[PDB]
Amino acid sequence: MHHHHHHMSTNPPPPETSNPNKPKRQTNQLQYLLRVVLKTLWKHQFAWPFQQPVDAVKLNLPDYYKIIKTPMDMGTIKKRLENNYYWNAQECIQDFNTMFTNCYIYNKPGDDIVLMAEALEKLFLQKINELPT
Ligand SMILES: COc1ccccc1/C=C/C(=O)c1ccc(O)cc1O
Ligand code: NA
Ligand code: NA
C-alpha cells in the first residue's frame, strides 16, 4: 500500500506568454499599458502577490486551482506585453480583470489579499481611465 503518499500537490503550467500563431499588434494603447499602467502597478507596495502565477504549493493552497480555472497574474501580463502577445488593449485589460476577479472569487471581503487587490484595482482603473488615441 502506497497510501497515495506520492500524489503531491503541484501547480498547473503557467498561462502562455507567446503564441506565434496568435495575431498580434503594437498599438499605442498596448505600449502605454506596459510602460505606464503595468509598470506603476508593479512598483506598488501591494503588487507582490500578483507579480507571478499563484504558487499554490508554496502558499499551501491546494484548493486554489480547484476553484480558479482561469489563472492570471501581472508577471504573465508583463511577459505578454513584452512579447507583443496582444492584438489590442482590451485583451490585456481582460487579463487584469481576470486577475482581480480570481482574487475576489478565491478569497473573502476583508482578507488582507483582497484589500491588496482592491487597492491595485483602484489604481488600475485610475490609470486606464484615459489611454492614448
Ligand atoms: C492567501 O494568500 C495571501 C494572503 C496574504 C498575503 C498574500 C497572499 C498571497 C501570496 C501569493 O499569492 C504569492 C506570493 C508569492 C509568490 O511567490 C507566489 C504567490 O502566489
Ligand atoms: Na470569494
Ligand atoms: Na491613463
From Swiss-Prot:
It comes from Homo sapiens. It is linked to Cornelia de Lange syndrome 6: A form of Cornelia de Lange syndrome, a clinically heterogeneous developmental disorder associated with malformations affecting multiple systems. It is characterized by facial dysmorphisms, abnormal hands and feet, growth delay, cognitive retardation, hirsutism, gastroesophageal dysfunction and cardiac, ophthalmologic and genitourinary anomalies. CDLS6 inheritance is autosomal dominant. A chromosomal aberration involving BRD4 is found in a rare, aggressive, and lethal carcinoma arising in midline organs of young people. Translocation t(15;19)(q14;p13) with NUTM1 which produces a BRD4-NUTM1 fusion protein. It is found in: Nucleus; Chromosome. The record marks N107 as: Acetylated histone binding. JQ1, a thieno-triazolo-1,4-diazepine derivative, and I-BET, a benzodiazepine derivative, have been tested on tumors with success. Treatment with GSK1210151A (I-BET151, a I-BET derivative) has strong effets on mixed lineage leukemia and promotes myeloid differentiation and leukemia stem-cell depletion. Interacts with p53/TP53; the interaction is direct. Interacts (via CTD region) with CDK9 and CCNT1, acting as an associated component of P-TEFb complex. Interacts with RELA (when acetylated at 'Lys-310'). Interacts (via NET domain) with NSD3, CHD4, BICRA and ATAD5. The interaction with BICRA bridges BRD4 to the GBAF complex. Interacts (via NET domain) with JMJD6 (via JmjC and N-terminal domains); the interaction is stronger in presence of ssRNA and recruits JMJD6 on distal enhancers. Interacts with NSD3. Interacts with NIPBL. (Microbial infection) Interacts with bovine papillomavirus type 1 regulatory protein E2. This interactions may serve for the tethering of viral genomes to host mitotic chromosomes allowing successful partitioning of the viral genome during cell division. Belongs to the BET family. The NET domain mediates interaction with a number of chromatin proteins involved in transcription regulation (NSD3, JMJD6, CHD4, GLTSCR1 and ATAD5). The C-terminal (CTD) region mediates interaction and recruitment of CDK9 and CCNT1 subunits of the P-TEFb complex. It is also required for maintenance of higher-order chromatin structure. Chromatin reader protein that recognizes and binds acetylated histones and plays a key role in transmission of epigenetic memory across cell divisions and transcription regulation. Remains associated with acetylated chromatin throughout the entire cell cycle and provides epigenetic memory for postmitotic G1 gene transcription by preserving acetylated chromatin status and maintaining high-order chromatin structure. During interphase, plays a key role in regulating the transcription of signal-inducible genes by associating with the P-TEFb complex and recruiting it to promoters. There is a cross-link at K66 (Glycyl lysine isopeptide (Lys-Gly) (interchain with G-Cter in SUMO2)). It comes from the Eukaryota. Ubiquitously expressed. This is Bromodomain-containing protein 4. Phosphorylation by CK2 disrupt the intramolecular binding between the bromo domain 2 and the NPS region and promotes binding between the NPS and the BID regions, leading to activate the protein and promote binding to acetylated histones. In absence of phosphorylation, BRD4 does not localize to p53/TP53 target gene promoters, phosphorylation promoting recruitment to p53/TP53 target promoters. Residues 25-131 form the Bromo domain.
